[PDB]
C-alpha cells in the first residue's frame, strides 16, 4: 500500500488583540481534464464564514472578509511559505491522484434496475440504483418511441456509501410494451428493462 | 471541476455547556474515503477496500488538529467572540436498494443544511429504539458552509413495519424526525 500525503497543513492565524464557535480548513485538489491540469486552493472558515482563501491559479491569499485581511497579508509576507503552497498542486496533490486513481476516479459500479407497475395501473417506476459514478442516463420508451411528456425523476440521489440511485416514473395508462433502458459507463452495453 | 480531493477539518467548541469536538476527513467529489478517530490516532475507510488499497499516518491529523484548535482561540479573540445563527437540519428517509419482502435492505437517513456539526439520529421500528448494525457517518460539508450527514439501519422488510429517524440537533428544541414504511 502507498501513503496518502496532506494536502496541507492549516496556516497559524495571527492575533490582533451559552456560545458556540467553529473554525475550519479545507485543501482542495482541483482535477481538470483528468491529469492535464490541478488547481489547488485552500480555504479558512470561522463559523459560517470563509475568512480567507489560497487559489494556486492566483499564487497568493485573498481576504474574502475584513477579519481575513491581517491573515492573508500576514502569510503573503512570507516567500518561502508561497512558495511551498504553491507546489501543492503537481506535489502532494499529483502524488495522491496516483495513488486514488484506480479505486475514485475509475471506480465502477453497475446499476441494479426494476421496473414496477404501481397503482388500477396509473405509473410505472424504473428504479436504478447501486451504481457509481453518478452520472446515469434513464429513459422510458412506449412501443419504441421515447417518452419526455409524462416522466417524473427524482434528482440522482447519495446513498453516501459511494453509490446512488434515481427513481423514474412513467405516468402512463396502459400502450402495448413500455421500457426502461439504463446507460452507465459500468456496463459494455445499456439495460434495457421491459415491463411485463 | 471535474473530481476533487478535499482534506476537510475542523474544531469547534459549545459553552454553556462546555463541550468541543473535531474532525478530519479526506473526502472525493460528495463521498468520504477516510476520518481519523482524533482520540484513538486511527485511520478509519469508509469502504474497506480503501485500506488495501491506501494507508495514511493518522497522527497527521492530529497534529493538524491541534493547529486548528489555536487558530480556533486566535479567531475567537479576533473576531470579539462573533457568533452566528444555528441552522436546523432537513431529513430524509430512503431505502439503499429496491426493496423485496424478506430481502435484507438497508435504510438510510440524511440529515441535511445543518449547522454547527452537532447532530445525533435515534431509529425506531414500531415505535421501539434499534441500535444493532447501525451506521452513522461524519459531518459532510457543503459549498453554503452547512453539513449534511448519513445514518444506516440495516432491516428486512415486512409488510406494516414503520420505521422512523429521529434527529438531535445541537441547541434544538426538539427532535425532527421523519418516518419510512416498505411499499
Redesign the interface.
Known amino acids: 500500500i502507498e501513503s496518502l500525503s496532506l494536502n496541507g497543513v492549516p496556516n497559524i492565524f495571527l492575533s490582533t488583540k451559552s456560545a458556540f464557535f467553529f473554525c475550519g480548513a479545507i485543501f482542495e485538489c482541483h482535477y481538470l481534464n483528468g491529469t492535464e491540469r490541478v488547481r489547488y486552493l485552500q480555504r479558512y472558515i470561522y463559523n459560517r464564514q470563509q475568512l480567507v482563501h489560497f487559489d494556486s491559479d492566483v499564487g497568493k491569499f485573498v481576504a474574502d472578509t475584513p477579519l481575513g485581511e491581517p491573515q492573508a497579508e500576514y502569510w503573503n509576507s512570507n516567500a518561502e511559505l508561497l512558495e511551498n503552497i504553491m507546489n501543492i498542486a503537481d506535489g502532494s496533490c499529483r502524488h495522491n491522484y496516483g495513488i486514488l486513481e484506480s479505486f475514485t476516479v475509475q471506480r465502477s459500479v453497475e446499476p441494479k434496475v426494476r421496473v414496477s407497475a404501481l397503482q388500477e395501473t396509473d405509473r410505472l417506476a424504473c428504479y436504478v440504483t447501486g451504481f457509481y459514478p453518478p452520472e446515469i442516463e434513464v429513459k422510458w420508451f412506449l412501443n419504441g418511441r421515447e417518452e419526455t411528456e409524462r416522466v417524473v425523476s427524482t434528482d440522482v440521489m447519495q446513498n453516501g456509501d459511494w453509490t446512488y440511485q434515481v427513481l423514474v416514473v412513467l405516468e402512463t395508462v396502459p400502450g402495448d410494451s413500455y421500457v426502461c433502458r439504463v446507460e452507465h459507463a459500468s456496463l459494455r452495453q445499456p439495460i434495457s428493462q421491459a415491463w411485463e | ?17 462546555d463541550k468541543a469536538w473535531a474532525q478530519f476527513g ?1 473526502h ?6 477516510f476520518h481519523v478517530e482524533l482520540d484513538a490516532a486511527q485511520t478509519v475507510w ?2 474497506p ?9 493518522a497522527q ?1 491529523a492530529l ?2 488538529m491541534a ?2 484548535k ?3 482561540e ?6 470579539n ?4 445563527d ?1 441552522v436546523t437540519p432537513e431529513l430524509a428517509l ?1 431505502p ?3 426493496v423485496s419482502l424478506e430481502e435484507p435492505n438497508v435504510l ?1 437517513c ?1 440529515a441535511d443544511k445543518f ?2 456539526p452537532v447532530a445525533t439520529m435515534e431509529w425506531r421500528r414500531n415505535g421501539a429504539v434499534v441500535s444493532e448494525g447501525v451506521y452513522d ?1 461524519v459531518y459532510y ?1 457543503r459549498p453554503d ?2 453539513f449534511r450527514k ?1 445514518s ?1 439501519l440495516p432491516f428486512v422488510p415486512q409488510r406494516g413495519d414503520v420505521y422512523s429517524c429521529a434527529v438531535r440537533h ?2 434544538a428544541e426538539g427532535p425532527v424526525q421523519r418516518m419510512w414504511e416498505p411499499e
Not at chain 2, 28 to 33: G, H
Open positions: 471541476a471535474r473530481h476533487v480531493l478535499l482534506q476537510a477539518e475542523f474544531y469547534q467548541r459549545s459553552e454553556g455547556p479526506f472525493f467529489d460528495a463521498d468520504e474515503l469508509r469502504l477496500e480503501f485500506g488495501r488499497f491506501a494507508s495514511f499516518e497527521g497534529q493538524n493547529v486548528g489555536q487558530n480556533l486566535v479567531m475567537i479573540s479576533n473576531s467572540r462573533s457568533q452566528q444555528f430512503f439503499a436498494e429496491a438510510i440524511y449547522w454547527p457517518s460539508g458552509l452547512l448519513f444506516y445541537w441547541g
